[PDB]
Each structure stands twice: as C-alpha cells, then as structure tokens.
Design a protein around this ligand. Structure first.
Ligand SMILES: [Zn+2]
Ligand SMILES: [Zn+2]
Ligand SMILES: [Zn+2]
Ligand SMILES: [Zn+2]
Lengths: 396, 246, 396, 396, 133
C-alpha cells in the first residue's frame, strides 16, 4: 500500500513539477526519486484484471533513467518524462482498480490483488518515499498501532432509518403517544408526539427519549442542535407498524421542554447539554441520548385552548422535536462523508466493471447496509479499498 | 558515466550489442537517436546490372548523420559525469569537443569516403557477398583518430585511369574464374563420361585452384577440396566444350 | 496562465519559507527559483489595464537578486525579500484582476489581458515551476486534451427554479393533479400532489415523474435521497401559471410508492435505485429521472378515511415527495460549489470595479443565468477566470 | 494515431512511388522513410483482434531494407519491396479494424487497442512523418487545442424527425392549424397549414415558427432556401399525436409570406435573411429559426374563392412551405456527410465482425441516435474511430 | 497572390511535416523553403488595415532560422518551429482577411490591401514555390 502510494505520489510530483522551462534545481530530488522508481520497477512483470469485466492487462517495465544535464527543463526532457509517466500512471490506475474490486473475510487489510501482493515484497521498498496524505498517514500509523484519525465533514455515521415508536396506541390510532425519527447520514430528526397533549399525564408532562448507538466512536465532534424537527411537523398519513392500516398525524408544534442531549461512551456520560441549542462539542462518544418533554402550556389563549380538549377526539396532536446535525467529527475508522469521494469511487469502479457481490460487502456497496453491520472485517476491507481509492484519485 | 548510469554488465553471446541495450536504456534524444542509427546502419543489398552490391544508408552518403553524431557527443560534453574526478572529466569532455568541433571536416570526410566507395564499387563485377571471414583486417583506432583529426578539405576521387584499371583487373579475375570453372567442369564430365574411374578429380580441382592464381593450394583443407569437387560435379558443361566432347 | 501561476506560487513559497532564523538549506531551491523569476522579469515593462474602474498601472522590474550568503536567514534578509515580494505580489494580483474582468466570445480560454498575453511569450517560460494546484492541473490537462476533473462539495449544478406542473386542473383549482419542485444548487425537492388522492386512478395509483437535465456530466457523485420534500408539505397559496389568480394547497404527506431514481447518460440508464434511501452513488450521469407514485392506502383508520372522501370537495390533498441532495461530485467542467470561493472572487472583483457587462457572462455574474445557458464559450471563459481567481487567492 | 497514420501513409507512398523505372531521386526520401519504418517495426510482436468475431492475429517483423544507391528502380527492386508492403498493409488494416471496434467512456480519444497503445510508445515516434490529411491535421490541432474544423458537403447534422405540431385542433380534425416538418441529414422541410386559411385570424395572417437546435455549431455554411416544401404538398392521412386516430391533410399551396430565417448562436442573432431565396450564408450558428406566414389573398378568382369558404367545412387546406438544404459547412466536430465514407467504414467493420454493443455508441452505429445524443465522450470516440477509418481507407 | 499563397503553403507544409520524431530527410526541402521565407520576411513591417471592424494590426518579423543537423526531429525543434509558424499563420490569416473585404471597380484583379501590395514586390518573389492548388 505504501509502495503503491509512493508510485502514485512520484507520478503526481513528476506531472506537476517536470514542466518545460523549470529550473533543474526544482526537480533534482524528484528526478532522483523518479529514477529510483524506474530502477526498482525495471525487469518486473505485472498482471492486473481478470475479475468481472475488468480486462486482463500485462505490464512490463523496461525504461531508461533521466540523466540529462540542464539548467532549465526543455521539451525533449518533458516528452521523455511524459511517456514514462503515462505508462506508469496507467499501470498504477489499473493496480488500484484491481485492488478496489477485491475483498476477503480473513486479512481484509492485507493486499488482495496479485500485483499489490508482489509490490509488498522487500525489493520494492526502495520506491517508498513521502507518505503525507491523510489516508496513507493513517494507514502507516495504524500499522504502527498509534491513534489514526480521519476527519469528516458531515460524517455518514447514521444508517438511514425513518421509524416510529408508539408507546400508547390502539386500533383506531386516534389517541397515540410515541416518537418518530429520521436518522440519516450526519443528521437526526426526532419528534415526540402526544395526541392528548399530556392532559392526563402526571404533572401535565410527557417524557420522550431517543437513544442512537453509533457504530463507531466519534471524537472532536461539532454538533448543531435545533429545537424543532421540520420533518415531523406537517400532516402525514403513516403506515401501521405491521402495514395492516394507516393512521393520521396532524402535528401542532410545542417547544421541547427540559431538553437534555447526553453524549455517552461505554454508558458513561461524557458530555451533557441542558436547554442548550446551536453549536455544541461532543469530545468523545459512541451513543447519543436525546431526552425531551412535552409540557402542556399552563396558560393558554382561547385559540390555543381550542386545540387541546379534555378528552377525545384529539384533532390536533402536540409535538415536540429536536434536530441534531454532526457538522464535523473525527473517527478512528473510515466513513463516508459529504466532502470525500472514496465511497463514490469504489462504488463506481465496482459498478462499471460488473464486479460480482463478494463475501464481505453488501450488494452495490450500499452504505446503509455496510454501516448497519460495520464489522471488523468490513472495516478492514473498507479501509483498504478507501486507501487505494485515495491513491487512485491522486492520478485519476 | 556521462549520464550517471550504472556501468553496463554486458554478457557475451547476447543477441543485442551494447549499443542496442544503451539505445533503450538512455533517455536523452540526441544520444539515443545516434545510438539508434549506429544500431541500424548495416549494409543494404541491391543488384545493379546483375551484380550484388552492398550500399550505404543515404545519410552516410550525404554525410548528414555526422550532425547527429555531433549532436550526441555535444550532449556528452554538457553532461555532469556525476562521480568522475573533475580533471579526468574535463579531459574526456575536451576530447569529445575535439571531435565535435570538426563537424564540417567530418561531414566532408564521410561524403568523400562514401563517394570513393561508390565509385570504386561501380567497378566490381562479382557479387559483393557479406560473410564473416576467418581472419580479419586489424584497424587501429589511433589511425581512425588520425583520419578524423587530420582530414582537410582537399577532395580526392579515383582517377579515370585508376577506375578503368580496377575494373579491368576485376573483369579479368572474374572471366578467368569462369573460364577455369568451365575447364574443370569439362574435364571432370569428360572423365566421368569416358569412364575413367581411376582418374583423381582432386588433381583437376588443384589445377583449377592453381589457375585461379590467388590460392596457395598446399593450405586448402581437404574437406573444402572435396566440397569443391562435389560442387563442380553438379555444374553443367559449357556449350563449346560440350560440343567438342560430343 | 502557467507562468502567472508560477509567479504566484513562487511568491507564496517565498512568503511562507523566507522567515527569520530558517536554515538556508530550507530555502536554497526556493531562492534559486525566486532569483530566476527576478532575472526573467527584470527589464520588462507591464501595464494592467483600465477596463471599468480598475486603475491603469505600470510595472517596472529592476530588482536585485536575493542573497545566498547567510547560513540562517536574519531580519535584514527577510526585510529585503519582503520588499521585493510585496512589489511582485502587487503586480501578480493586479494582473489576475485585469484578467478576471475580461472575457471573449471567440477565444475565451486564451489570455485577454495584455500582461498575461505578454507572459505567454517564451522568454518567461523559465519562471514556470511546480503546477500542483487542482485548477492549474486541470488547466494543463485541458491544454493537452486529457481527462480533466474538478471535485465539488455540493456542486451548484441546478439553476434556481421553483415551478409547478398541473396535469389536471380547472379554473377553481379544487381538483388538481401535478407536481411542484424546487431545483436549487445541489438540491432537488419534488412533490407530486393529487387532490382526489387517486380515488379514480386506474389502480388507485397516481404516477409522478420529474426529469432534471444537468447542463454538464457529473461523475463519482454521492447523493442523499430522502422520502419527503419538506418544502412542499405545508399549506401554500400559489399563483396560477399566468398569474391571473391564486390557488390553495393543503398537503397531507403520504409515503412515496415505487420510488425509482434513474441516473441517465445519453438517454441510457447508468444507475437505478428502487425504494432505496440514504446515500447512493451515481458514477456517471447527465440526467436524473425521479419516478414516484401516490398510492391510495388500501386500509385507512377512521381519521385517514375522513381525510380522503370519494368526491369533491377535497379539503386535504395527498402529497408524495422526494428530496435529492448532491453532497459531492466530479465534473470535467468548472462549477460553483459550497466550498470553493472562485465565483465569489470573480463576482467581487467585477462589482468592486464596476466592470461593464460583457458579451459572455450574465449582467451580474449571476449564477442561475450562467448555468442555465452554459455554452462552450461561457465554459472556456469561466475556466479561465476561475483559474486566475485560484491563482490570485494564493496571494490575496 | 499519428504513428498509425504515418505507417499507412508510408505504405501508400511506397505503392504509388516505388514503381519500375523511376529515378532513385524520386523516391530517395520515401525509401529512407520506408527503411525507418522497417527498422522500427523489426523485432516487435503485435497482436490484433479479440473482440467480436475479429480473429486473433499475431504479427512479427523481420524484413530486410531497400537499396539506396542505384539510379533507376527496376523490377527486382519493386519485387523486393512488394512482399513487405503487402504484409505491412495487412497489419495496418488489422490494427485499424481493431481500433475501430473499440470504445471507452473515460478516454475515448486515447487508443483502445493493444497494438495502437504500443505504437503510442516513444520508440515508434520515429515512424511519424507528414500529417497532411484533413483528419490527421484536425487530430493534431485538437490535441494541442487549436481552432480547427472539418469541412462537410451536405453534413448529416439533423437527426431524422418527421413530426407535426397542432396549435389548433379538436377530436374531428376538420379545422386544424399547425406545422409539419421533416428534419433529415442536411435538409429541413417545414410546412405550416391552416384549414380555415386564416379567415378569422387577425389581419388574415397566420404565423408559423420552426426552431431546429443543432447539436454542434456549424460555421461558414452554405444554405439553399426554397419557398415550398414538396414533402407536405400532397394529400396525406396522418396518425394522431397519440396514434388513437388518423386525420386528413389536403394541401393547397400558397406562397409563404414574411419569410425570415434567423441563424443564432447561444441565443444571439448571427444571421438574418428576410424574403431571401436561393443561396445564403450562415457564418456561425447552432440554431435555425424559420418564421413564415400564411396570408389570405385579398383578391381571389372564382375558383380560388371557391377553395376557401367563410366557414366550415374546410376541404382545401392552405399550406405554406420552406425547404432548407445545407450544401456545405464547417464543424469543429466530426459528422457523417454525403461525401465521406468514415461512418460507413466504421459501421461496416462493426457489423462484419458482430461487435457487441458497447457503452458509448448506440447499437448498430445508428447515426440518428448518435447525433441525437452527441455528447463530448461520444464525440471523442467518434473522432478516434473516424480518424482510424480514414487512415484505413488510405490503403483499403 | 502567389507570394501569399506560397506563404500559406509553406506554413501548411510546416504544420503537416514538422512533427516530432520525423526524419530530417522528410523536411529538408521544406526547411530550406521555410528558412528562405524567414530570411525574405525578416526586417519587414506590415500593417493589416482597419476597414470596417477589422482591427488594425502591425506585424514585425525577426525570427531565427529553423535548424538543420538533426537526424530525427525532436520536441525542442518542433516547439521552436511551432512558435514561428503560429506567428506566421496569424499574419497570413489577417492578410487574407484584409484582402477578402476590399474591391475596386477597375483593376479589381490586382491586390487591394497594403500588405498584399507590399508582398507583390520583387523582393518577396523568392518566397514563391509550388503552386498546385
Ligand atoms: Zn400502529
Ligand atoms: Zn392554475
Ligand atoms: Zn458542507
Ligand atoms: Zn391530432
């Protein structure tokens, strides 16, 4: 992985720096690294593809070194370098694609393609140089077992789930108390509804709780907490829990009461935020507990009092809400997020070449299924393919 | 050494010459292009007036390729020679420039050499067969240095009388060769058709080689003598001699 | 462009690396590149033009070389370098501004300012060195006709449009069937409404289809798809298509049925997602087809059955929705996005100096008009100005 | 491509110029180029054809050179050359066919076959010489991104479309107003019909408009505009817009009135011709807007007055027509045309070897679908295959 | 006209034949013609006129000769040739456009623009070569 990244990095630096007219002093070290790459790869045969519709491709390396003396680079130098770089970039892209489409339940972090397994030999370690990218840096740190940290803008940590819980219900679905939520991506909208508006609730307060267990521990997380959940604040015909029938929801939004957002690690309260909205920081957590209360207004204007009668029918249903958006976070594991394209790249490569479903990932690399059952083998394979995809993105 | 490349570990019997490996392993266009030419500048075969002739690349004939050589070695004069001691490097580069700065003289020399070769080759009558000979002519590279560093601009072409003499000697040798082949074949065929089974064709072949005037017959290997006998036996007899024999 | 970018890059490296106390070995190559720039620019007279309110400025270069004598850089060295760097940064910023405010219909990719046209002469090719920025990389790839790639977080690919289509309508607008959508930036919210709730539909199914044609091809796209469209889920009073009258919309949100999101390229189906929500990947597409259905619930609780009668009047109107956000994508063309500031920089420079409207861009640098009519000439000019803006942002 | 073109060009020049009895001075440079080709190809192994029914073929080169000192070529020289020429021509034809049947979505301009990919190596660049054909010239300019155009006689720019639009209609289809058009190749025949003959129209004038949006900009185009559409000048029985019924058209041709042709580029009026028939020049455009009018003749002879009554039934339907033929044009992109055989060659090669449908082109190389969705990737692949086809037609 | 045609023909031949890697024997006569054109045009000032909205343009020619002494053309050679060829092609296109927009009632076969009238002098006749179109 480090040798493949070094190949890609050398090729990227050659493309960016070996340009007509530039001083040779701008590239001398780069030229030496490029020549080391050529020497190390010379006389080696590689094969890629042979899986799905990915074509079999053979690669033989017989290239000369760059040894010309110049003060400034000219067109001849750049054309020679360009020919060599084009061949090497094609080889690296094919190796990356071959590795991205493969997986194993055992040793999923280890190389899977024969080309990358061959690149893991000692004789190729000479190619290795600067490893500065976040993904390769995390790879090296993990191989050393230090903390690795991936920073995510809007991490895709919550599998999609639009669900509800009815704590009080009956077949007519006209006197319901419960919660409905959408946990999607970095976002959580939750709403506790009571059709009676806590008319008979002790102290005229109805308590709602929502526990969301993250599949991985998040750290240094910036969270936006807003009082209302816009997704559960309009009239809605919802299906029955078993699908037999449909019930009606006619929200009237009351501000949530006694809001407590707890960020827990191993069941222990790491962060607690009471009646606090806007930007908050969760420094280290694996679970979120949103506890909020529907409090019946002690004093109502006639228009308000008309909405909440003493008994059924309950035409307007009192709803309190909460919206929790993870703007940014850090995770030791790899995740999809709004800013990066690694999941997109892997999925595109697997779809384009019609890669059959393997024993590790779900069909089509569906992120919801993958994150729902984010097993250690899945995590290893995902980190491998994401690192390969980041390596490929440097060139392609 | 100029390009800082690891010294070639060349293996005898390799189908590629050292320059053929260097052409692939050297990236500089001037040196690589000169190496390509040197690798592919073998003789071309062409029949003119029924005579097979070994002819040169047209870039040799007009002397233009010397420019490429110049270009290549000019590049060698600009190279760092990374690890070489600097006084030795300076000496090598100044020698490279000694040859480089005679570009016009070397173009003239190449054109003169090619023209003289073509003019004297017009006077050849027997096929110019290319075979690697047992013994060689030893060419000192110091004589090559003398020719490269001392040639002026005085054109010297073969004299018309020299060309006529060369052509006459070639024609005489060719005609004598053919006539002695005819005599040997006639006598061998007559001896066979006269059923002279005790006749030794070895004596006939030795007389033939002696009349060719350029063979010391005592040093002809026996296998070659018998092969010569076999090949002479296969040739048909010339019409005049065969009619006389009939 | 490569020479201008190299000037800006050298200046940025000088600002970052020429600091008090630094080892000369940390700056040796940078000092050589900077002195090469000084040699190349010396003796050349430049003029940045007077288009709009931009002042006409004359630039002369008669600078001495930076020293090589100090083992560690001291304060005097940094001050002299600062003087030279300040003059060069002023020149480069003025050249970038002059280039950004200009446009051409015939050759929009070519330099328009006289200073950048002069810098395209061969004598300045010596200044050229490392081209590692994404925009300059894409510029160089484009000049060679190679596959270009710009990565966008929330690409601004949809021109703003809040529109509706009534497939069934009548003068009083009480029995309406149709679709209303907002296409804004990276987001598409669509909602199909039936006032009769598909009572008389062939199978109690009302089919809605929304086709969005992207002005450019997007690849490696991560897309969040959510069932509901919150924007069309509250009561609205909406102008008629001709503005003659206003009609009433009273949505009640039903779950969309048979949701099929198709990502099409050249009219061919590239990606299909049926009943899938959350994060999906569209590897290569230029058109989105969202098909959904309002299905009448076969079984209704008394309240739900009360909402939807058999005939008019229809007080509650059945609405199904869909939300489609493009979190990230890759495009061969330049686009405005939520992360980069190129469009903002170009627009700010044009407004600050009251640049008269040109023959290429809309008369505000307005993005909706620009992306609606994204012509090849507009794309060439926009790539030029965005590359120059990225160059300027390195220094300003 | 340039190497393949140079191989084909060298072989063509060898066939044409290496002829018995010619002066060696007539062929000296050609013989040098031919020997360079032999030298470069010698010792190289090539493989062509593993796609569709194109058989796998293996090519080896161990040919001798040609003499260089004789004064006139003789039969022996030509005989020596002919065997090599035949083998090389077969190899070039097979390489061209291998490249013609291949396509890709990522880099369609880049070589796809293994043979052409190998020929893209630096060592084969020595074979490259005069690139004088139109297609190779455009290839080279387009690689450098210079303005270059292909000249077409009767360009095939309009996808086949025989359609009609009714602006006035009703179920019986006895009083219709609208337009019917054929868009085919370089031809637009349009006809506006009014069944009432504009009896009740304001000023007794009925206006018809037809807009044709070309998929590529045509420049320096010669257009023949005639005032009648013979295609829509005879009785027709025409399907309804949904195929539920057939209506009747019974034209009587009146001359078109206020004929205006507007050739527009990016919505801007570039050329305008009013009441002009014959040859006109459209210098640069992507859209053709034809406006014409049916005017009632204020004075009618008894038969003419009998044709057009004051009210229904309308048995003779007044029709005005226009015909627009693009005789020749220039387009920066490749197109099929009446003179070239590139499309025919590519289609023939693909059909003869049963090439499976790829991801870029439509099945069977259908031109109507290809020009309906002429995307940049399709344009890249089409330019590649058309250049290869032109190279192949140089020898086959 | 023949001088203008020969300029255009030399430039087209240079663009088609001066390609990276080609044998110099393929371009020897072309290089000679190109250098003859450079020598003839050097030191001459031209002005393409301002008829209509055609911009007034000034052209100065001070160019080095295309090199000899290469067995195969390399990238540096092609780059230098392309720079010179681009400037010359721009000049030729502008001269052709300036001539295409002018007309005279009498002697309308003769050149109308100043650039083409200047090119009709004897000193530019050296540029003239193959007139095959
Ligand atoms: Zn229920
Ligand atoms: Zn309406
Ligand atoms: Zn964001
Ligand atoms: Zn109809």
């Amino acid at each position: 992985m480090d040798v493949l990244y070094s190949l890609s990095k050398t090729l990227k630096d050659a493309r960016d720096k070996i340009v007509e007219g530039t001083l040779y002093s701008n590239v001398s070290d780069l030229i030496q690294q490029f020549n080391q790459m050529i020497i190390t790869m010379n006389g080696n045969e590689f094969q890629t593809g042979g899986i799905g519709n990915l074509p079999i491709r053979n690669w033989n390396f017989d290239f000369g070194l760059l040894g010309t003396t110049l003060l400034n680079l000219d067109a001849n130098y750049v054309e020679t370098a360009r020919n060599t770089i084009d061949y090497f970039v094609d080889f690296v892209d094919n190796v990356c694609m071959d590795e991205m489409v493969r997986e194993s339940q055992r040793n999923g972090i280890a190389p899977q393609s024969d080309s990358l397994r061959k690149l893991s030999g000692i004789k190729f370690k000479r190619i290795n140089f600067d490893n500065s990218s976040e993904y390769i840096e995390n790879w090296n740190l993990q191989n050393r077992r230090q903390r690795t940290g991936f920073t995510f803008h809007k991490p895709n940590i919550f599998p999609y789930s639009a669900s509800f819980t009815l704590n009080r219900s009956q077949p007519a679905h006209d006197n319901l108390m419960g919660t409905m939520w959408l946990n999607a991506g970095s976002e959580i909208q939750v709403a506790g509804f009571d059709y009676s508006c806590a008319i008979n609730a002790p102290a005229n307060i109805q308590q709602f709780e929502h526990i969301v267990q993250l599949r991985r521990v998040l750290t240094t997380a910036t969270i936006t907490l807003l009082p209302d959940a816009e997704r559960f604040s309009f009239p809605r015909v919802i299906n029955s829990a078993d699908g037999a029938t449909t019930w009606y929801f006619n929200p009237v939004i009351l501000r949530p009461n006694n809001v407590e957002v707890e960020f827990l690690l191993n069941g222990q309260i790491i962060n607690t935020y009471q009646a606090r909205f806007g930007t908050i920081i969760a420094r280290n957590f694996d679970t979120i507990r949103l506890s909020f209360q529907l409090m019946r207004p002690p004093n109502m204007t006639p228009a308000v009092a008309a909405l909440f009668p003493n008994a059924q029918p309950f035409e307007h249903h009192a709803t309190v809400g909460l919206t929790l958006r993870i703007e940014s976070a850090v995770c030791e594991s790899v995740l999809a997020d709004a800013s990066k394209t690694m999941l997109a790249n892997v999925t595109s490569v697997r779809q384009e070449y019609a890669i059959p479903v393997g024993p590790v990932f779900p069909p089509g690399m569906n992120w919801t299924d993958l994150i729902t059952n984010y097993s250690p083998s899945r995590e290893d394979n995902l980190q491998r393919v994401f690192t390969v995809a980041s390596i490929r993105s440097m060139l392609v | 050494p100029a390009f800082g490349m690891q010294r070639m570990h060349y293996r005898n019997g390799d189908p590629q010459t050292p320059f053929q490996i260097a052409e692939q392993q050297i990236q500089n266009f001037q040196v690589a292009n000169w190496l390509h030419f040197v690798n592919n500048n073998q003789f071309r075969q062409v029949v003119i007036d029924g005579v097979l002739n070994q002819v040169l690349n047209d870039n040799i004939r007009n002397g233009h390729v010397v420019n490429q050589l110049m270009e290549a070695l000019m590049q060698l004069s600009r190279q760092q020679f990374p690890t070489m001691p600097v006084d030795y490097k300076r000496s090598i580069q100044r020698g490279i420039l000694l040859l480089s700065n005679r570009l016009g003289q070397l173009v003239d020399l190449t054109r003169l050499l090619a023209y003289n070769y073509e003019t004297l080759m017009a006077c050849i009558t027997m096929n110019m067969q290319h075979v690697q000979t047992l013994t060689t002519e030893k060419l000192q590279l110091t004589s090559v240095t003398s020719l490269c560093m001392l040639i002026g601009n005085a054109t010297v072409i073969p004299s018309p009388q020299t060309l006529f003499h060369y052509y006459n000697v070639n024609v005489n040798f060719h005609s004598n060769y053919n006539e002695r082949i005819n005599d040997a074949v006639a006598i061998i065929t007559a001896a066979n058709r006269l059923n002279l089974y005790q006749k030794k064709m070895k004596s006939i072949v030795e007389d033939f080689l002696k009349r060719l005037q350029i063979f010391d017959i005592s040093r002809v290997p026996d296998d070659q003598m018998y092969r010569l006998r076999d090949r002479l036996r296969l040739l048909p007899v010339e019409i005049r001699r065969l009619d006389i024999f009939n």
